[PDB]
Amino acid sequence: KRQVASGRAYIHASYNNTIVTITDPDGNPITWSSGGVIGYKGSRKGTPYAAQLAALDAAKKAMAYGMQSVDVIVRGTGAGREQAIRALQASGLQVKSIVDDTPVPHNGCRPKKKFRKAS
Template identity: 55%
Template sequence: MATDTENTDKAVKEEKKAPEVTAAAETSNEEPKKIRRSKKKTVTSGIVYINAGFNNTIVTIADEDGKTLCWSSSGASGFKGSKKSTPYASQMAAENAAEKAKSFGFEKADVYIKGVGTGREQALRGLISNGIEVLKIVDLTPVPHNGCRKPRARRN
């Protein structure tokens, strides 16, 4: 059997859960605020960064200020494992990134290539084949001046 104190405690808890409505809120004729969608910004020219590593290729497209618009990679394009490091996967990654950039009105780009992966040239061809005009190509591959020791050669 429930005691009187338990019943009153339950009633108090139920009262706390119910939202309070003030008289001013009921009488006001204000409409709920409409949420405005921001327009998609149009960028006609920008910068394309191609990072071609041994295992993957990442293509990033940015506006002239350096703010990223879109990106794609071999892995994001559906390739897994050792297939990510192929030139074809790099080309597909560049084409996917270029397609996304086209939705912003992207047409011209400066291309900065970094890395020594197999997909360097193919990624550049993928951009050109998708209709992006390349204004300049810069190689940013870091070259050591006899810094760190190279990794050992693989055994057969």
């Protein structure tokens, strides 16, 4: 449809869930894939294998729309960062730029209970 043949990939890597969103150069999202899309449930959504499957799925639906090369822009510290990177780099995309872009607070709001006891 868009046939821009080049977008960007935002990989939201959480401990519980892994989401990948492919967007146009402008930043408007083109398509998104999750762990629930594959139908996987419970704790095992954080398993690397599920993230691999989501990544491949997103790649296929992307090539469906004319994609060739993207910029991977990884976010968060999910259990499946590097594996999804490896999957998508060799998924058939001519990926140009990969950058870690984890949004860390500059010591702002006070975190929840389990994130306390800081050193």
